[PDB]
Structure formats: C-alpha cells, structure tokens
From Swiss-Prot:
InterPro entries assigned to the protein according to its UniProt record, in alphabetical order: Arc/bac/fun_rhodopsins (IPR001425), Rhodopsin_retinal_BS (IPR018229)
Segments in the Cytoplasmic topological domain: 85-87, 143-146
Family indicated by similarity: Belongs to the archaeal/bacterial/fungal opsin family.
UniProt topology in membrane: Multi-pass membrane protein
Full protein name: Sensory rhodopsin-2
Self-association state and partner proteins as the record states: Homodimer. Interacts with HTR-II.
Residues bearing PTM N6-(retinylidene)lysine: 198
Organism in which the protein naturally occurs: Natronomonas pharaonis
Encoding gene per record: sop2
GO-annotated molecular function: monoatomic ion channel activity; photoreceptor activity
GO terms under cellular component: plasma membrane
Amino acid sequence: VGLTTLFWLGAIGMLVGTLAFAWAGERRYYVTLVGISGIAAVAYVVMALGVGWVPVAERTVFAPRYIDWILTTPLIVYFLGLLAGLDSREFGIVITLNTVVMLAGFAGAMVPGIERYALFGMGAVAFLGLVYYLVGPMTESASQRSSGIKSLYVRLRNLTVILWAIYPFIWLLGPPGVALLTPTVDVALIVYLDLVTKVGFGFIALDAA
Ligand SMILES: *C/C=C(C)/C=C/C=C(C)/C=C/C1=C(C)CCCC1(C)C
Ligand SMILES: [Cl-]
C-alpha cells in the first residue's frame, strides 16, 4: 500500500460525496457541502499524481493538503454557523480563529527548524478558542432554533469537536513533528479523518434533511 494508493482512495471518497451532495441539492447548505468535498477531491487527485510533495529538511510535506484545509475548514464552520443562526459578526470571529489554526499549521509544516513548534503552539492556542465558541456561544445561539435544528447542530458539533481535536496529535506524532509515525501510517490516518469530517459530516446532514 503506497502513498499514491491512499491519495487515490481519498480522491474517490471525496468524489462520491461530492456527487451525492450535488444530487441531493436550503440551496446554501447543499452548495457548501459540494465545496467542502469538491475542493478536497481536487487536492487528493493532485497529491495522488505526485504534485505538491515538497521536501523540507528530512521530511516530505504535502502542500495541497494545507490549501485544502484552509479553504474547506471555514466552510465547515460556516455550515455550523448557519445551523446555529449566527449574526454576521460572530461568523467573523470563528472564521478568523479557524484561519489562524490552518495558517499556523501550514507555516509550521514548511519551516525546517524548531521554530515550527512555536507555530504549532500558536495554532493550538487558537484552536482552543475555536472550541470554546463551538461549545459555548454557538450552542447558546443554536438553542433559539427548532428542536430538530438544535439536535442536528449538536450532533455535527460533537462530531466536529472530537475529530478535529485528533488532527494536532496526528500532525505532532507524524513527519511534521517528532517524525515518530511513518508517512504511510500518518497519511492513512488523515485520509480517514478527512473523509469522516467532510463526507461523513455531509451524510449526517442529508439524513436529517
Ligand atoms: C477537512 C479537513 C479537516 C476537518 C481538517 C482539520 C484539521 C485540523 C483541526 C488541524 C488542526 C491543527 C492544530 C489544532 C494545530 C496546528 C496543526 C493543525 C493544523 C494540524
Ligand atoms: Cl504535511
């Protein structure tokens, strides 16, 4: 099982999700889910073709992964913000916090020296602030909606919080960090997480609709 095989698997999974969401497509929600998995599909194909594998010191960094995350994770937060009924100002805070996490990870991965752990730490701090907004203010806000919408928000929120919290550990234990986990295992774990936090996320929304 090679890296390219794992990338192709993620590509196929994202593509199936993309077509499923487009078919089922309230247009805003369905269009967002197409963007979430559609962008990831492209990133995985590019990586499957061997494009964007950047050598850094003694590790290999996958640049398309971080461009993907920077564009798709704010769309996931946007989806959750619509469910919770955020005003346009609360959106700005959480999307700003999200972008800090994603940019810090991208920069830390691309830096060869130990300064990269300083960048990782900053993303960790901003992530804790993002979790606070999901579990607190956004949950208060979602409470004002129908019982079914509130229930859907809580289920997507917990899926999001629990799984997103695993990524920094995979990053740190993998090549970008202490380089303990091997690239193949590290990639396999992230392909699984990407698929669940995007396509699984999406199908839980379809089921409730
Ligand atoms: C579809 C892709 C998803 C949901 C990716 C999520 C990625 C994260 C939650 C990554 C978080 C990170 C930290 C909290 C600190 C810095 C390193 C990151 C980017 C792995
Ligand atoms: Cl990486």
